[PDB]
Symmetry: C4
Subunit: 323 residues, 4 copies
């Protein structure tokens, strides 16, 4: 495994981060979840990404159990607060109340004294940033959290929060965008801004839910246990955008020669592609298959040639999404 | 139930707040107090107002017991410190000593780790605001209180305290005035000042102790179990001002047609009237009658027409108290 | 009992403070110490003055035991740190180390969660005031102490420490000088400076160890159990200054008519004299005799006429010590 | 024993500090380690120097056990954080994560609530000094550490950290350089800078691993149980520099007359030499021999004549290392 700095900080994360998102009513057995996390550790993954809301507390509980026994110095636990976990209007968002009432349950379920990275899930316009950042100061002073992150935040608001955190001794070191070969919205403004502010990216949908594994053929029936066949949760439509486009699916199939050139699967090429941006500390991978994790983990530290990066842009052409 | 922001904060309160004030020697059975709080929850009330001094600790103890089992994320607990609860000159006021010695008893009696809103009951000229605000900073850092409020405070002193709180990361978000159709002292200066400072009003005597239910006829014997018949405590004289005035009692009776126009009881009209001010986050209701609570709770989110607000002023005329 | 503000603070102290200083090898039985503290409470005394060093922890232990059961809101506990209580050079002074290692033993022996007033005993030139004041900030944040005081401090250094405390949210409200009818060193600079800085005086040797009770006749054998007969500790020489001067002893005897004029014992006149200075919050009294405490306690709130204050100066004349 | 101020602070250290460095696989029995620490206490040593990394936790555990029972006020415990103690890239360095995860193990092994001096072992360029100093602020606020130190740090970075510590109420009072008669690299810049910043030196290799005891003759077989015969760990090469130079070994032998002049062993002269610099608070001594400790301890407070300091420079000549 290769490691990077999360921003201007002393924290190193693995270049490959394991995420274990589950749906509130999910059919994936716990035994399959635990063996995937076990496969991530075997591949040298140190960094784990979860949320209170994932599985409605189940995702954090399973992770807590899988990692019990791993020495604490060897793990970076990233969790999130902001999505609804309680009934009523104080059971969500980034108020002092919701954050204070969230942290202790996250600690219990993960079986730890402190969370390495605590991420504000979504930006919440009701809470002033002075309220939020002082709430984070209190949790850092108490040693319940070490570092702060944000996911899906307007860039003006990232800068503001970084500013206040510098004043209050809150390390704001991490932003979580959607980033892949196909989705490059964050190249325009977010990564340039974040880099100046000492913030690194931990990136999600890096395989666009399997579309960048080359495993979906244009005009075909999708494979046996593929995500296309089992579309649980409101993320299935984000995938439908690409599966209902035989153009993209065919251009993704043409990357395979480029990958084999470099001695990679299409999956490893897509993961290595994200890792080529200096603004990126980590790529998150989803999988409940041990063999997929151990293989996806090997993208860590791979440099792609200037030549191969120019040919990738040519093949994908106008299917790429910018800003 | 409808919810509002308490000031410029992430905290939402219900538009209808339940208060459970008791007298130090009070004849109201506990079973009647517990069933009223139970009726408030059934009506969707999330926000509860009490004080150390109410019932001499009895009011907080009963509330603690009634709300045991309700998830913490679903409640906003507002309590007060400042009124005498101990013997001698340090057993009252807003000194570091009295506040530090008060908070832990409030937490025990309410059965909670933290109080949502901690209100300085009355302004106390002996304590410098620097002493008080640093005492509140220490309680916020420790996570024993989340937000700070004030009740019956000079407006210069609200501004001063808001200023220092912004500097020390103390959210000062709440002021508690007397406010009704008949008592509009806070329109003049308090609500305008508070609105600029990011402070919302949680309002009391919103029915002027039942006078704005239309239930008292000019020149009559007051009903069986009415507050006029059972005048316990030094709040009875504030009511006597209006009951010894057949003029007001007759003008209140003439609102009933205006209420029925809007499909409301006089009580619901009086409560909705307060809620029409943008500076108001919540109206407090007193009652030890389930049927009264469930009915008063339905004023939440009712808009009154411009027409009806002009006709209300005409009927009440010069009985209204301003500044 | 009458009460005063300790400085610009919300803390009230009794005008009569009980001190229980003992010598490291002292013959006074505990039963006599406990009954004196019991007599102080009966006289309405709320404020108690002690030190880690007094009796070598015995003075604090007895006070802790005597006051067990008294409600906490009704007491002001003043203790001191700075005098040697341990072996070696870190077993004394005002270093972070000595103060941090002192506070928990004081709390245990007094049987309390927090000390009302924590006094820096003597000024210590080795420790920078930034180190000391940050150590006091940490103890206030933790709620182990509420207010800070100083005893026998240069006035430049009182001002400096008051300045830093205002910056760090440390209430510096109390100075402890030697002050009596005969010893007026603090009138010159200390009380004027302290009054501008919001600091009140709690005063010691207010009877000059019994010399201002009129109980010592010039050219006589001192009474049976008098302090002159039992000169334990290095405070006996401070008394010898006045007992080896038949002039003063005779001028003190001539105050008795002035006292009887006002319906006071010479002791009550001497105590009331100190309390006439607006810069004074409290006079400390020593006694292990119940009848003396109950009588000395009655000086509280006595105003002396302008006439009587001019005649007192005439009688004592040039025996008075100024600066 | 003689004592000095550690910088501009209230902390006194003994002029002779005992260090107990061990190698991760070391043959020295625990019984020999415990009796050496016992000999240090008997010689009046109050100050003990160790590290998490020394013996891989064994050095701190033995020290913890040897000092159990010694009153806390009588000891200054100096430990270090920064060297690798865990697997992976967060198991080392000065990140919030590594420091937070280190302190509690150091406290447990030493059997104490707080560490007197916490030293950043090596400077770590990955961690910004704002992250580090706020991590130290949190540990001081919590009372887990009292004072902060640095070992082997660039001088620009000492100044920067001292600056931030003054702002955050972190006492930065201590630097640990290599310093002896033969190694004077720190005279050039480090001690002058440190003295202006209120930082004192606790010095190591003060005998250059026994070379300044005069016990190694040029062109000979080194004694029975001498360090030259048993070269464990990567510090043996630093010694080889001097043992492979018959010139130095012969010049060290010629100091013996100068030592006997002053009534000292060559060891006592070398230790007293370091202590002559006003910028030095303490000299660290290594030994697992009781008789060596009790003798080395007697250098404490010895003044050397101007005459003897000029003759020492003449004898050692160009073997001395400067900058
Ligand atoms: N910060 C945020 O707001 C946010 C939002 C969403 C997600 N996330 C995080 O990011 C993660 C994203 O996971 P994701 O699964 O949604 O997106 P993804 O990582 O783009 O997709 C992973 C999926 O692609 C398929 N796949 C991966 N490698 C493969 C291989 N070598 N061969 C064949 N198929 C392969 C697998 O599904 P099948 O084999 O079943 O097709 C796998 O479950 C989540 O776990 C979560 O922790 C964060
Ligand atoms: N911040 C402060 O300093 C402060 C000061 C005072 C009070 N408060 C708070 O505000 C609350 C005010 O309560 P309050 O009772 O004094 O004043 P209120 O809310 O104006 O009066 C409520 C009373 O009016 C009558 N009533 C209400 N709805 C009715 C209906 N639909 N039909 C018939 N009668 C009805 C009831 O008494 P009867 O039926 O018995 O006549 C009821 O107890 C207290 O509980 C307390 O929590 C705060
Ligand atoms: N902050 C500081 O550095 C500091 C320093 C010293 C003391 N103090 C405090 O201040 C206190 C001073 O006590 P102190 O006793 O040294 O000085 P004091 O209060 O001037 O003297 C009290 C003594 O005078 C005699 N006395 C008092 N009232 C009397 C009466 N009505 N009739 C007859 N005799 C009477 C008693 O001794 P006999 O009857 O036995 O003659 C009594 O013990 C101490 O307890 C201590 O807490 C503080
Ligand atoms: N801050 C840092 O980074 C750092 C780095 C290294 C060390 N240190 C500290 O500094 C200490 C340095 O210890 P050190 O032993 O490496 O260097 P040292 O103190 O220069 O050498 C001590 C050694 O010299 C010999 N010796 C001492 N006195 C003697 C006498 N009177 N007669 C004969 N031989 C004598 C002994 O070895 P033999 O008798 O076996 O020859 C003894 O073990 C360590 O314990 C550690 O705590 C700190």
């Amino acid at each position: 495994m290769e490691f990077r700095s999360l921003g201007r900080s002393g924290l190193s994360v693995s270049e490959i981060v394991y995420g274990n998102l589950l749906y509130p009513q999910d059919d994936t057995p716990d035994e399959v979840v635990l063996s995937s996390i076990r496969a991530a550790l075997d591949a040298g993954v140190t960094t784990f990404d979860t949320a209170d809301v994932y599985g409605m507390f189940r995702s954090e509980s399973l992770l807590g159990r899988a990692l019990a026994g791993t020495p604490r110095e060897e793990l970076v636990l990233c969790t999130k607060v902001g999505m609804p976990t309680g009934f009523g209007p104080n059971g969500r968002g980034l108020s002092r109340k919701h954050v204070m009432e969230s942290v202790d349950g996250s600690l219990r379920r993960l079986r730890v004294d402190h969370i390495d990275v605590y991420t504000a899930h979504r930006y919440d316009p009701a809470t002033p940033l002075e309220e939020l950042m002082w709430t984070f100061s209190d949790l850092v002073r108490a040693g319940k959290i070490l570092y702060v992150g944000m996911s899906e935040w307007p860039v003006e608001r990232i800068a503001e929060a970084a500013g206040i955190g510098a004043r209050l001794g809150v390390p704001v070191i991490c932003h979580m965008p959607r980033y892949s070969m196909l989705w490059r919205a964050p190249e325009a403004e977010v990564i340039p801004a974040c880099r100046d502010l000492g913030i690194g990216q931990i990136c999600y949908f890096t395989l666009e839910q399997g579309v960048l594994t080359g495993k979906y053929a244009p005009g075909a029936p999708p494979p046996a246990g593929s995500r296309a066949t089992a579309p649980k949760g409101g993320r299935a439509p984000l995938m439908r955008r690409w599966l209902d486009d035989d153009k993209v699916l065919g251009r993704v199939e043409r990357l395979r020669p480029l990958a084999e050139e470099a001695g990679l699967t299409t999956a490893q090429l897509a993961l290595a592609w994200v890792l080529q941006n200096p603004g990126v500390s980590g790529a998150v991978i989803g999988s409940f298959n041990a063999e997929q994790v151990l293989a996806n983990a090997e993208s860590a530290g791979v440099r792609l040639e200037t030549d191969l990066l120019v040919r990738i842009d040519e093949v994908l052409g106008d299917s790429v999404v910018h800003d």
